Amino acid sequence: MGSITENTSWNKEFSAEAVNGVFVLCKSSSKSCATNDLARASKEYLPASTFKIPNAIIGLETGVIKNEHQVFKWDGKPRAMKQWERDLTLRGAIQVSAVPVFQQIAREVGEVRMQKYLKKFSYGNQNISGGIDKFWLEGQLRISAVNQVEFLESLYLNKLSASKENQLIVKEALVTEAAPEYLVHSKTGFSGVGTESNPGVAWWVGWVEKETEVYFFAFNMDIDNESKLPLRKSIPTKIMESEGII
Amino acid sequence: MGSITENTSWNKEFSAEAVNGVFVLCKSSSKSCATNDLARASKEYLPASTFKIPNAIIGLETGVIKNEHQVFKWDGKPRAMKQWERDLTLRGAIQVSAVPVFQQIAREVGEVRMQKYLKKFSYGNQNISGGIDKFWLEGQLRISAVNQVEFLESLYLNKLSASKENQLIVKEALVTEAAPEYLVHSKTGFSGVGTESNPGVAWWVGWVEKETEVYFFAFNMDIDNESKLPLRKSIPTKIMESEGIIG
Ligand code: NA
Ligand code: NA
């Protein structure tokens, strides 16, 4: 989504760190969202690691991922991070953001089915061109913070074009904080440090269930140095703590 | 389960707190369980609050609970705990162990259906005598720690006689700790202090998903003073920490 309203009270959390970015926070639904930056809220960026959310759903829907207990075996050959050099469950691969596991899922899904599902999901600009195993890493796919919270709301409500079972499976894999009072589902992304005069993007997207309320959120920021990466969680966390949500 | 073995390594965690209790810990991959006390692992106790797990599944299966987004509204009449005096989701009602919500679920399920599902689930002695809204807390229902882990393994595998959807809904409601390397699902129970002569029971049951391994656990202890209640989590947590599973 409905209106997007600007909230100036969050800018201090960005300025304190010299961060150029956006937070979008929607209470109850995407009908009413708040943001620090109206223009950037709808600006589209490479999804990077946040693409594992639709990719997992599509993997399950197509049967490429058999069910939530499938183990993705490591073939013993070098992977870019040591934490990826092991057998992984679906939740495990999401939580350590094991790119090679999801590259193989994408290859098996294939371009025709991938395009079909991103159209169904209204996922960003739906541009998968240039390489089926890297379009979300270095390709032309782009999605905004507002679109992320619309997509996550659909997932929360089990309203994506997928079985409820498969949406529930992916939601369980995204739980990142549990307390009696609230539950956080979320996913990070980081495209890289970019190139000269062209920074990369870092993301944190998800939702919070607190009492009988739900809050959808999406954060992104420009980033050209990996030492800044934790700000993708700390800035939105500080905003949501000051709102009383977590 | 495939096998069970008694292990003395864990007794020190009980003796340090002067607790009479049992821990059962089962590793899925090896189909192997260990316990500090084989006799007590087979003893059957009131499930108390741990019964919210089957009760939630049954409520969903029967349609008494619509789905995971149903809100259980507070009517404004005082409840035994201020923390229950509010609208609650299914997860919320499970996490604060809101007795009156699940009493009403049980009433709507009814005796005939409740009996049928506890038979399907092989849940304890399947005796629901004592009142449809109290049999798990003050009635004749009894379940052992071994039976709890058998039941929880079936839930984890979506092998209970319920839709996978409803098993998944209840599993999400049971998540109590999330870390990048492991996920804990769990539920507490407490029957009361009983007497000095005949103490109550306190429970902590659940499972841990770590790497590709899954550990099913059930803890219970005698309890005659509510000040000891935190031990139902701290003793099994210290044991699972010393095995390298959590923390
Ligand atoms: Na790799
Ligand atoms: Na981070």
Residue numbers in the entry:
A (entry chain A): 19 to 264
B (entry chain B): 19 to 265
List passages from the publication reporting this PDB structure.
To test for formation of Dha-containing species 9, the −18-Da protein product was subjected to reaction with a thiol, a reaction used in protein engineering to introduce covalent modifications. No reaction was observed on incubation of unmodified OXA-10 with β-mercaptoethanol (BME, 1,000 equiv.), as monitored by SPE-MS. By contrast, after complete modification of OXA-10 to give the −18-Da species (8 h with excess tazobactam; validated by SPE-MS) and subsequent addition of BME (1,000 equiv.), ∼80% of the −18-Da protein was converted to a +60-Da species (relative to unmodified OXA-10) within 2 h. The extent of conversion to the +60-Da species 17 was increased to ≥98% by simultaneous incubation of OXA-10 with tazobactam (100 equiv.) and BME (1,000 equiv.) for 12 h and was decreased by prolonged incubation with tazobactam prior to BME addition. With OXA-10 treated simultaneously with tazobactam and BME, a +60-Da modification (in agreement with Dha-BME 17) was observed at Ser67. In both chains the hydroxyethyl oxygen is oriented so that the OH is positioned in the same location as the deacylating water in the active site of unmodified OXA-10. The different stereoselectivities observed for intermolecular (BME) and intramolecular (Lys) additions to Dha 9 are of interest from the perspective of use of Dha in protein engineering.
pmcβ-Lactamases are a major mechanism of resistance to the clinically vital β-lactam antibiotics, with >2,000 different β-lactamases reported (1). β-Lactamases are grouped into classes A, C, and D, which employ a nucleophilic serine in catalysis (serine β-lactamases, SBLs), and class B, which employ metal ions in catalysis (2). Oxidation of penams to their sulfone state promotes bifurcation of their reaction with SBLs at the acyl–enzyme stage to give transiently inactivating species that are more resistant to hydrolysis than the nascent AEC 2, turning penam sulfones into transient inactivators of SBLs.
